[PDB]
Amino acid sequence: MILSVLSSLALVSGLMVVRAKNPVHSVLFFILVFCDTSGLLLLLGLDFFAMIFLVVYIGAIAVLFLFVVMMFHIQIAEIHEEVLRYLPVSGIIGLIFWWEMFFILDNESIPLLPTQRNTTSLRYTVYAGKVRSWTNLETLGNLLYTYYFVWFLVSSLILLVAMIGAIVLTMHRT
Amino acid sequence: PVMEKLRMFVAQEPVVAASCLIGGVGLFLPAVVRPILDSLEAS
Amino acid sequence: YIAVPAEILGIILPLLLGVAFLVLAERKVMAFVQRRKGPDVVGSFGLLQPLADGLKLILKEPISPSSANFFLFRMAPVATFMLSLVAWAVVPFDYGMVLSDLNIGLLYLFAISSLGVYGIIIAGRSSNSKYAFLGALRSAAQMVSYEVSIGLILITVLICVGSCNLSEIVMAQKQIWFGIPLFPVLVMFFISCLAETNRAPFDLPEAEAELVAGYNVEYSSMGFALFFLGEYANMILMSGLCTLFFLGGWLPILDLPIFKKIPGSIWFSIKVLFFLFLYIWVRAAFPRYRYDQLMGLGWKVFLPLSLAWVVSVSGLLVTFQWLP
Amino acid sequence: MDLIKYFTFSMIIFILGIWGILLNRRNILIMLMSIELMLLAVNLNFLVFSVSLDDMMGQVFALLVLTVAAAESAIGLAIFVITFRVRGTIAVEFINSIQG
Amino acid sequence: MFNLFLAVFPEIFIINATFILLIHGVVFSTSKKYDYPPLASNVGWLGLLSVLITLLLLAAGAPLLTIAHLFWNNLFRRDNFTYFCQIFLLLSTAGTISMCFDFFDQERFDAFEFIVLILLSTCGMLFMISAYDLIAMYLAIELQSLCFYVIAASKRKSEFSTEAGLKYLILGAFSSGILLFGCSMIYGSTGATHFDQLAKILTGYEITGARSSGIFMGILFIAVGFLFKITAVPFHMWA
Amino acid sequence: GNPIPTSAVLTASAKHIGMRCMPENVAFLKCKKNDPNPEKCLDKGRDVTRCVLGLLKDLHQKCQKEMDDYVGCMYYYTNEFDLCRKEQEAFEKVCPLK
Amino acid sequence: PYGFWTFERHNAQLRWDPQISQVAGRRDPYDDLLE
Amino acid sequence: MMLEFAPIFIYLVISLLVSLILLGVPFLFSRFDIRFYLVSILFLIFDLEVTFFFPWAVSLNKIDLFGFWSMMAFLFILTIGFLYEWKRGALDWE
Amino acid sequence: AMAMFLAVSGAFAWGMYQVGQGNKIRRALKEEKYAARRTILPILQAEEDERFVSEWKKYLEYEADVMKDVPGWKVGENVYNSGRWMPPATGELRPDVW
Amino acid sequence: ASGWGITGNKGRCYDFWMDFSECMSHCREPKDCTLLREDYLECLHHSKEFQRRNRIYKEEQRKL
Amino acid sequence: MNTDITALEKAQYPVVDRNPAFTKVVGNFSTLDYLRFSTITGISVTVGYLSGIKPGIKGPSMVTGGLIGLMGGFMYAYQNSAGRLMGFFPNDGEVASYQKR
Amino acid sequence: LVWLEAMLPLGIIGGMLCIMGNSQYYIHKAYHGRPKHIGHDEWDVAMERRDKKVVEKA
Numbered sequence A: 001m002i003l004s005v006l007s008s009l010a011l012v013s014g015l016m017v018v019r020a021k022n023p024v025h026s027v028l029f030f031i032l033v034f035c036d037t038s039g040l041l042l043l044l045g046l047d048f049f050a051m052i053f054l055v056v057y058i059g060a061i062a063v064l065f066l067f068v069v070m071m072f073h074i075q076i077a078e079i080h081e082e083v084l085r086y087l088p089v090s091g092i093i094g095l096i097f098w099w100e101m102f103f104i105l106d107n108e109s110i111p112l113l114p115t116q117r118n119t120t121s122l123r124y125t126v127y128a129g130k131v132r133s134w135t136n137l138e139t140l141g142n143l144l145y146t147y148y149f150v151w152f153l154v155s156s157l158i159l160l161v162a163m164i165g166a167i168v169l170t171m172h173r174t
Numbered sequence B: 001p002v003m004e005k006l007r008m009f010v011a012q013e014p015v016v017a018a019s020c021l022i023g024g025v026g027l028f029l030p031a032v033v034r035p036i037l038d039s040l041e042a043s
Numbered sequence C: 001y002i003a004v005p006a007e008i009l010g011i012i013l014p015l016l017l018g019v020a021f022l023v024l025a026e027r028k029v030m031a032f033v034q035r036r037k038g039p040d041v042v043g044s045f046g047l048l049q050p051l052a053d054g055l056k057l058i059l060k061e062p063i064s065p066s067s068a069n070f071f072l073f074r075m076a077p078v079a080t081f082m083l084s085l086v087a088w089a090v091v092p093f094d095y096g097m098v099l100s101d102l103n104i105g106l107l108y109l110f111a112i113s114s115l116g117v118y119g120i121i122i123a124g125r126s127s128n129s130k131y132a133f134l135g136a137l138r139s140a141a142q143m144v145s146y147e148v149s150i151g152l153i154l155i156t157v158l159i160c161v162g163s164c165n166l167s168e169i170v171m172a173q174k175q176i177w178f179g180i181p182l183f184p185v186l187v188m189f190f191i192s193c194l195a196e197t198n199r200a201p202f203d204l205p206e207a208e209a210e211l212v213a214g215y216n217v218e219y220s221s222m223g224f225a226l227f228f229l230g231e232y233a234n235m236i237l238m239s240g241l242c243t244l245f246f247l248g249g250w251l252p253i254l255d256l257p258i259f260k261k262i263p264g265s266i267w268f269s270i271k272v273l274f275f276l277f278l279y280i281w282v283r284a285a286f287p288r289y290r291y292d293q294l295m296g297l298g299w300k301v302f303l304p305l306s307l308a309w310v311v312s313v314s315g316l317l318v319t320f321q322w323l324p
Numbered sequence D: 001m002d003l004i005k006y007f008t009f010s011m012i013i014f015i016l017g018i019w020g021i022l023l024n025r026r027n028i029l030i031m032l033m034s035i036e037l038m039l040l041a042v043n044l045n046f047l048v049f050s051v052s053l054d055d056m057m058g059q060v061f062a063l064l065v066l067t068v069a070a071a072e073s074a075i076g077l078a079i080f081v082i083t084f085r086v087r088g089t090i091a092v093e094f095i096n097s098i099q100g
Numbered sequence E: 001m002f003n004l005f006l007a008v009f010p011e012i013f014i015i016n017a018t019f020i021l022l023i024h025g026v027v028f029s030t031s032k033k034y035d036y037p038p039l040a041s042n043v044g045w046l047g048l049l050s051v052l053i054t055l056l057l058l059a060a061g062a063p064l065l066t067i068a069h070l071f072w073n074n075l076f077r078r079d080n081f082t083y084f085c086q087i088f089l090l091l092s093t094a095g096t097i098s099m100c101f102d103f104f105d106q107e108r109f110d111a112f113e114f115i116v117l118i119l120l121s122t123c124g125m126l127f128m129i130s131a132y133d134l135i136a137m138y139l140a141i142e143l144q145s146l147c148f149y150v151i152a153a154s155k156r157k158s159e160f161s162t163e164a165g166l167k168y169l170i171l172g173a174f175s176s177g178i179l180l181f182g183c184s185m186i187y188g189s190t191g192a193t194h195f196d197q198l199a200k201i202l203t204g205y206e207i208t209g210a211r212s213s214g215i216f217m218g219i220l221f222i223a224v225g226f227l228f229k230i231t232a233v234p235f236h237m238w239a
Numbered sequence F: 001g002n003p004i005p006t007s008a009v010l011t012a013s014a015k016h017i018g019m020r021c022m023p024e025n026v027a028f029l030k031c032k033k034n035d036p037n038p039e040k041c042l043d044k045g046r047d048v049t050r051c052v053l054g055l056l057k058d059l060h061q062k063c064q065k066e067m068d069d070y071v072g073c074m075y076y077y078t079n080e081f082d083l084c085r086k087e088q089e090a091f092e093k094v095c096p097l098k
Numbered sequence G: 001p002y003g004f005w006t007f008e009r010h011n012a013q014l015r016w017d018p019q020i021s022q023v024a025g026r027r028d029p030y031d032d033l034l035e
Numbered sequence H: 001m002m003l004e005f006a007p008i009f010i011y012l013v014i015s016l017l018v019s020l021i022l023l024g025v026p027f028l029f030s031r032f033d034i035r036f037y038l039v040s041i042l043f044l045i046f047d048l049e050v051t052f053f054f055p056w057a058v059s060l061n062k063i064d065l066f067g068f069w070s071m072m073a074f075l076f077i078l079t080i081g082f083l084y085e086w087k088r089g090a091l092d093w094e
Numbered sequence I: 001a002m003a004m005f006l007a008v009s010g011a012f013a014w015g016m017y018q019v020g021q022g023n024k025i026r027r028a029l030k031e032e033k034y035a036a037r038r039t040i041l042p043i044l045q046a047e048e049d050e051r052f053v054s055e056w057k058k059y060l061e062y063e064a065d066v067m068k069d070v071p072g073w074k075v076g077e078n079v080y081n082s083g084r085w086m087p088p089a090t091g092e093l094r095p096d097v098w
Numbered sequence J: 001a002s003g004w005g006i007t008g009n010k011g012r013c014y015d016f017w018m019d020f021s022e023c024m025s026h027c028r029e030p031k032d033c034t035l036l037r038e039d040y041l042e043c044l045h046h047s048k049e050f051q052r053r054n055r056i057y058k059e060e061q062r063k064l
Numbered sequence K: 001m002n003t004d005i006t007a008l009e010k011a012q013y014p015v016v017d018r019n020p021a022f023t024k025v026v027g028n029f030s031t032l033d034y035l036r037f038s039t040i041t042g043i044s045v046t047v048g049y050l051s052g053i054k055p056g057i058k059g060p061s062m063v064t065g066g067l068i069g070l071m072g073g074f075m076y077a078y079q080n081s082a083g084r085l086m087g088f089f090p091n092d093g094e095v096a097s098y099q100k101r
Numbered sequence L: 001l002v003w004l005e006a007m008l009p010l011g012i013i014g015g016m017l018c019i020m021g022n023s024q025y026y027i028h029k030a031y032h033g034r035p036k037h038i039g040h041d042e043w044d045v046a047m048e049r050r051d052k053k054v055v056e057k058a
Ligand SMILES: C[C@@H]1CC[C@@]2(OC1)O[C@H]1C[C@H]3[C@@H]4CC=C5C[C@@H](OCCC(CO[C@H]6O[C@H](CO)[C@@H](O[C@H]7O[C@H](CO)[C@@H](O)[C@H](O)[C@H]7O)[C@H](O)[C@H]6O)CO[C@H]6O[C@H](CO)[C@@H](O[C@H]7O[C@H](CO)[C@@H](O)[C@H](O)[C@H]7O)[C@H](O)[C@H]6O)CC[C@]5(C)[C@H]4CC[C@]3(C)[C@H]1[C@@H]2C
Pocket: A001, A002, A035, A036, A038, A039, A040, A042, A043, A054, A114, A120, C086, C108, C111, C112, C115, D001, D002, H005, H006, H008, H009, H012, I091, I092, I093, I098, L049
């Protein structure tokens, strides 16, 4: 039910991303999609990722998109087009993807049908793992810098490439 | 004669010089002092 | 949960009153430095001035210029005001006096700070005015620039504490307030807070006389009031954060029974008041930077120093095994 | 039913990105935005699986994928900027000279 | 501890040399005293030297690249196949660089960053060859791809070069998203991303009636990304 | 009579429990280590429970008032030892850990 | 080949993971109670 | 536990309502500057740096010297990039 | 000149030493709480085991009744071939955090 | 398969994984490790458990 | 951090020291190691000088090339010396020095 | 002593902050019977849930 609400908000906001005539409006709806995603992450208990999605996707990436799109001052004539003639091609491609890809987990991960019986009493509690609980943050930090440090450093190389490319392609020094 | 070039760099860029000194202390301590403290503990 | 709204109102309403009187206190202190009297007619000692100004604002007709961004224009002040309000959910005023005891509270505060830029950007763009747009772009760039240094200083405190929980950050200062060993970091944090709240000497939106139009120039009535209220609430919040991170929050100055008599909320309030006074004092003392100068300071001075302090603190704590 | 609901959420985001590619033939900025939507959906897929499987590998890779998404958007918007600067317009008819 | 890193001596050297060349180029390209000299050819010669030294380090240390394989196992896997593949990659990079000097001086393409981006992409491809996990493979592929996006648009005032870059970035990002989706489906279906674990889980069953549609479509999406990369029809028209 | 073995009572008595019911605790933990199935561990659990409830009744008999105050403060502060030092000292002075 | 996954090169995890079996983050919760 | 996030949601709802009341009661009586893109890029990079700092900062007690030096190498790469930006004039707004 | 530099440097050194001392004390406080949780762990686990076993017996009787007259059934059949005991799966992704 | 759990302990399905891997490390035919493999996959997805419980729910709905 | 130097392909020569210390490896440098080191550094300095003439920075270019060559040559000499001590490379000298001290 | 006029609004701000702390503290205490506990983790939640049974079923 709550996942129905968040998924409905995400569906509408994403349609607005892909269908809003004004690109500034598209960037703002994109920001709504990331907020809803963060809500889902909070439902999963991943509060670090929930906050980082706000900090990075909304706080940095969407800001970059907004700065660029706002200064472009795009006129609608340059990007307008009628989409009524795409309904069939989207219908087949969407349906095939829908029929295959929304139900891919069904055969492997069969849902438990909720019965008219209190199964909550069959939840077994192991207190041993509860003496010293780890946050999402410290569980991730136990791994990033020691056992998988090479991937961490390669990501640093990727960011360095981004910095160099941004300078070389756009810089015009006064 | 690189002993007043460093003087000139410090005079003209005090912030960068201070940042280099602070970070360099932060790097020097684990690189040099920590293995010394570990060695004195073994014996 | 039925009593949760009562707690939320007991936070929000006194905060709005505190902002209303922070405006008055700024006027009073500024006047007294300038050898004049601030508002002292509307109410005794001018204490009814904020209510009169708020009443005037609500009784002012709204304009809503004939723009094509009718919804966005009114929603921008709502966004900035709500963001200023919601940061207080995790602020502890004393041991156990906090609405949400978030384990990830530090990162949550960083996220709210990062979200603050959108109200200004949207107000500038939606107002259909090139001057407002340019001013909003400059203000947004300044805020994102100083957010980097704020985040790195946060990391320094986090290294010292080992937990993102604000109450834990306070209680980790029982032995010593972090502002003593990290005093330059505290100075850096206060300056970055000034720049992040668009306050003097970094108040570009206040520089109309310098041919720099603010992002809220097209706003009237309660949208303009919402922008103003959010700004002053953020000033109070930055003072509170300075208190929490470096002055030991609700802790007394000395661990003695004489000091432990007075409640921790009073200690916290007094430290916050000191920092608000410093906000006003600084506005009274100095002229303002140009945009280019303050951007240079943000990227060329405060970022390198913040990163250096991160490296030095972490290296020292690792070396002697003093980590939390 | 939790896992099927979390997966279909990310799935609708991915399908929306695909549709945004399909519906935006004159608007390549939205095409870039649709690609980010797909990347977000994949990131969500890794996080959900990490919880469902009680395994940390999904979480490490999610963080690294966020780094890749950031660099991708930075470089892509730089290329958009220089294309616009050369042509003075973002219309697709001015980026169709290489053909055949 | 230090000897463990003998398995990555070639990569350490080339990365460090690339950093040295970046610093050298940026320091002297901005020099008023030296009148902002073009450094594309100087950095190109130094980078050709760096590539050849990397090749020497790798070829002459064939057994050492397999040292500490258990410690490095969850990061990469070096063997004879990767040995020869990496040697060939370095030789190709050296030849390509050697072919660039007349272009640098006669066109006057003065950007030394071109050489740095080539070297960083070579680092990425080196890590691609030794990748033994979906995560490592994706990261190395992305590093390589981002370097290409930037260098494809290097003539930043040219209509042709900017068009190439724009088409490359959009189609490359799309294909990378498809591949990442496939990787996520495989992880969700098997709980594994390491190639050894995937081999153990998937062997002996293929499609035994009760086939993991998650595994089958993860493979398909990964294959689509790979086919885009090798410019196979119908994922070719970017090329 | 027998105190209700709430979280407050158990947490306040935890030091006495660790000093007194150590063999039963260790035996239970070994058996849990070998087999997580709850049915295959009920006997060691009964041994643990009997030891703990006997110690609880004993401590209640010896120092009723100090135990009551310490348990009450522990419940009031949700088992935060630091906010309960005075009554902890009063409880341990009359009911030594031994 | 027949049973290639049997070849020692492919059994890396079977020999590495026991060496990290006592590392915080992957221990059985009962190991802390008894150690 | 995620229990503590519920008051935040109710707080958001109440703050929104206060905003609407305050705003609604008075209704009763073409010059692209690349330097903004560049500052956005720099903010993105250092935003990710802070992101990666957070788990490291809370994990220093467990990762010890290896984690410290791995993060130092990360920072070395990013700071070489920063030096490149500084030399090229990306940090100058004059 | 040198006065504020010496003051800042000395405050940094001595204050960081004090930060280390405070961290050590905080760590000891946490170990006290954590030891308290360790000594009362067995009795809580034994109570939970008894509760779960009784509930499982009730559910097995329920399943025996419901699946009466369904041929080929086996009440409480372990779906794992190894037969090692696992808690019943719940079908909620992250129930423990809420 | 990694063994790193999301709460800082051994992953739920890691012992099943290790039994399956140890079996396959010496059995020249993977069909000899089928049972351990399906135990690992059952731990990941609980498919047979949920199917059986759904059969119970189905029979309850049929007899009511 | 758990470590394991064990290689996939075993050493084909006697193992004088399974995991030799850094300073031990450096002190194990032979005349041939120093020849490799010096040759790589000299070639690198020469390339730096020659490629630096046209831009007008032959001195700084020599320094940059020399830094690259110093690092590469030291890494190569270390590789050879450590491989000899570990038994991966022909190590007659190491075995002879080991059977005596 | 005229400067004391400026201390009144600051004192009001301080009192406001004290209210935002103490009012929410006392409302929570009245509703839950005990003050809020900082650092409520999985163990504390499990303790409260089990204590509901151990109390009500006695
Ligand atoms: C800084 C800026 C500002 C903006 C921002 O950040 C950025 O601000 C941030 C602020 C964020 C919000 C913060 C907070 C929330 C609340 C969350 O919502 C909690 C929902 C969860 C918790 O709900 C319950 O959890 C416990 C029960 O689970 C309750 O405990 C009881 O039960 C215990 C056990 O008996 C007893 O022991 C206890 O004693 C007893 O009290 C507890 O009271 C109650 O809370 C999940 O619950 C559900 O999940 C269930 C599982 O799926 C569903 O089950 C169903 O499906 C099953 C089959 O699958 C069937 O078997 C079932 O029959 C069938 O019902 C069902 O739908 C429902 O239960 C939804 C997300 C949201 C809005 C965030 C949005 C995003 C933001 C606005 C961010 C935003 C971006």
